[PDB]
Write a protein that binds this DNA or RNA. Sequence first.
DNA 1: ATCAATATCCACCTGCAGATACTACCAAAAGTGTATTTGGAAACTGCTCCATCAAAAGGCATGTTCAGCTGATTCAGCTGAACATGCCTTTTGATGGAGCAGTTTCCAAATACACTTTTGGTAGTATCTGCAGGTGGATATTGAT
DNA 2: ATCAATATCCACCTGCAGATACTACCAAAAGTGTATTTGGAAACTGCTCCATCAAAAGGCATGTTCAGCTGAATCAGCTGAACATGCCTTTTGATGGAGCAGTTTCCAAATACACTTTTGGTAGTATCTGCAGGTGGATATTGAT
Lengths: 95, 95, 98, 98, 14, 82, 87, 107, 107
Amino acid sequence: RSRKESYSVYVYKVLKQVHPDTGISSKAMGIMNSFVNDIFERIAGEASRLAHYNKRSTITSREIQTAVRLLLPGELAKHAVSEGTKAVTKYTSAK
Amino acid sequence: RSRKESYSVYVYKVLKQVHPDTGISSKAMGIMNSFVNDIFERIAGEASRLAHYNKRSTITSREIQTAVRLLLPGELAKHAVSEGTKAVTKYTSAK
Amino acid sequence: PHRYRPGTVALREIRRYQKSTELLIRKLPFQRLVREIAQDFKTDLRFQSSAVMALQEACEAYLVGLFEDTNLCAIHAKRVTIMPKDIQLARRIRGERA
Amino acid sequence: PHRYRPGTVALREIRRYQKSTELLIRKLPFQRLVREIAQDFKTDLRFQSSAVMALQEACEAYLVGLFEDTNLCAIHAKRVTIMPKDIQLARRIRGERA
Amino acid sequence: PGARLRSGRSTGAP
Amino acid sequence: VLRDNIQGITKPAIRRLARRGGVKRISGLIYEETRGVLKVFLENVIRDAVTYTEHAKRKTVTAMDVVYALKRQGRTLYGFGG
Amino acid sequence: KRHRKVLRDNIQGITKPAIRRLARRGGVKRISGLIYEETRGVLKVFLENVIRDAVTYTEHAKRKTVTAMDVVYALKRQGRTLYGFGG
Amino acid sequence: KAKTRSSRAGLQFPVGRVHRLLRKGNYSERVGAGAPVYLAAVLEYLTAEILELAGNAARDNKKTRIIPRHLQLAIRNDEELNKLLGRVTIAQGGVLPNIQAVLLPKK
Amino acid sequence: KAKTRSSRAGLQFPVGRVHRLLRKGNYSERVGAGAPVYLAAVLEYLTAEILELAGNAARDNKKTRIIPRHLQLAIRNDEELNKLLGRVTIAQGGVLPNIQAVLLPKK
DNA sequence: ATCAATATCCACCTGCAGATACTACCAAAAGTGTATTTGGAAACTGCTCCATCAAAAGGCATGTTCAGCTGATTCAGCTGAACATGCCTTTTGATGGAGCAGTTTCCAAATACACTTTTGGTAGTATCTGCAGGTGGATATTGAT
DNA sequence: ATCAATATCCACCTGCAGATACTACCAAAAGTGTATTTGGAAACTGCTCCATCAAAAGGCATGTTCAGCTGAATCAGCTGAACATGCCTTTTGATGGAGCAGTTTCCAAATACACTTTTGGTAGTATCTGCAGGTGGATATTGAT
Ligand SMILES: [Mg+2]
């Protein structure tokens, strides 16, 4: 009877922004969880290595961006980099 | 002249233990150095992951041991597990 | 008395099974085979339901991938019939042995 | 004047290059190719000489590997001459391409 | 002004 | 009427797998060769999985034991955790 | 200053003979004449992928020099781990 | 008085959770303020991209509920997602319809 | 009475160094006393195995000094080291002599 | 062509498995306020990378020549695809208990600190020596005949 | 099965390049040996969900008939190997110039940490409905003729 966290709530918000009339099966949602956890580990992983390679204690937005450049193909990178630069912009301008 | 460290000194010790009249080129030694750092990372990495998978915050000889079983093939694992189990039990009962 | 020619039902199976996602091995024979192979690593072992499904999913996906690469190796030798030497070449170039 | 039959010097060369470890591409051409490709990604780059030698070591090991898989592909098709379609199949099975 | 996909669709507005 | 568990992986099943893979024609030798490959796959994965199980001092192999094993064997599976 | 001499067409420095030699190490006995241009294509794609990741490491380090470590880290990433040049 | 780091950053994805998962994950001693904002944006983008194309696929099969089959079709029909997930098995996804041309009957 | 943990454990390989690299590499919050000793011993075992076989390749080729070719011959001629290092390039190794049978002449 | 057998396709229907929606409870995110750690900014090294050039082996390009490989053709025999049945195995649905996991408790083990001591790196120096590269000369391999 | 052209082998014989091996030497790291923290093995227990086991159901084993695929034999066209010839470019080994990595010292931001306040996200639950079947009847496909 203990808390089993997931990304379901967020996957479901993003689904409703993108396909407001569209639902998602339990199995599909399991695949989207696996997805987010995977890309999480891949990105955090490369960031960690990048930080270690430059003798740094700290993983900043910059290590996340370089990681994303190394890990995402062609146009996915370019769009991910701008969504990520944007969210950091919008957050730095929030009193 | 910043002290850039390696496993050379130890590699050379072990060379003399097994082939006492045998030398090693600095390239060959370069390879042995890469070999040690690589296996080090692979084992440490499996171990790090093993501990996270089990909600532990400590890498013990137990985690190294399982890592060796996952990473090394059959016989190399058997012997590596021996030399490790021996080295520890001895280190422990040498205090 | 009407009989379909060799390779006409084959194409039809291809179109049917490429359209579906159902597992294509029977559960119980697969479950038995897992438990056998496992027994030889640790005895008196229990398996979560999902744990066996995860294996079957993985194992079927693997073999289907392998049949695709195999098929390309048969077609490369100017045949349409997969043979052991196809499966063996696919595995060799994928780095699964030799 | 006495000729070796086609194949005899080829086998002589295989024996010779398989015995040795020397890089097989000229140093300077390869360095220009590295500087050209790098330059098109970023201007004003320099290279540690070792960085280039590492690239050359990594490229020759890759191409030699790929020719072994390519030759298996030619031999599977009952030829002894490698052709593009052999390289293409090797890379498709290595999953270096779709 | 939310997430913009490769297709060119957006995530609504505010 | 008793037989090996591996032969439980029947000709018609292996035929269905091949068909998903777009295979038209199948030599009779394939069926034993496929069983061969299958066994090795399951050997490699179940070994690592059970090694997870033993490390967690459990007597039950979990989905995660398998997902973690599939991930290190280069066969990452989505939909069963992780 | 001097600015650098223009680099063009360097892929053709990978001569037919150099490609024969590599094939021979790989155990090849006979080579179609189309193999040379196919190998150049494959080599360019390999070097572009390694160098793009090397140079990303160089840029993240805020250096202007690509090090052997940059290359070694790129190779490791690409699953072509190289021994003999550090790390 | 309290306003989620997510709501400040413009994101559905939890900036707080991503920060904690970066801590409890032994990636580094320290974690920049922005790093979890960026990471959460990237994960949201990629989630949008996949739910976009999966949505499209679901609609096409005259369907309003995304299933794994729809995920597999979106991914394996996108050069870029297919590369990013080249070594990944979507359970219950099947494959793309693909018959090698030479396997088609003659007439 | 300063003993190194190497000597306590009966190892050439440095247990201190290995303890520290496990520390600075952010593998985990904390590192047990056993872990560095075990790991240094496994690294020492494996480097002994490779030097045994490369030593033999050196002697077979009528040489006193192990070069990278000797390490490549050792590793590639050993089923288990070959698997351990199957995605690894040994600079200046070369390859094993190996000609496919069909390529050899005559009947 | 025709003609029929079977497969395939689309509209409509409908029961419930598997979604979406709703609520209270608390773990874990956010807020505030000191407590440490860092990662540029400036300012110098020497390291090492660019460049340029001269002389000479060493490999590249190109054209000629023909051995033998590839791939098109033909064809025979064997080997897989198809198919019609019932029985045997799997699938489905309904109970006992192994053991996972929840959780609290206390000590053996790991951290934190700041000492003292020793290792391992390097620069510098010399000091040695394995072997690459060369050169004959005796021996093996290949291909003509 | 003879012979000659030319490749290959192997044992000598050098001159270093690169290895080994001193130093002395020091600086950073490993070790020592209390002071402080705490993570995880221990023991208990509850309640999932796993193994087992007996009716419901379709999938598979089987043997026969032959369509058409594989692979064998043959042959000619022409591609790719060998090699001779001419010479361009790479290799090598200097010199000088400087760009830029790599250090080492102030710190003012930046992030960690310890504690408190707040609420978003989870787990029961409680409804709602997408769609997997099923049926009917039209049309397309395949293969006989
Ligand atoms: Mg250019």
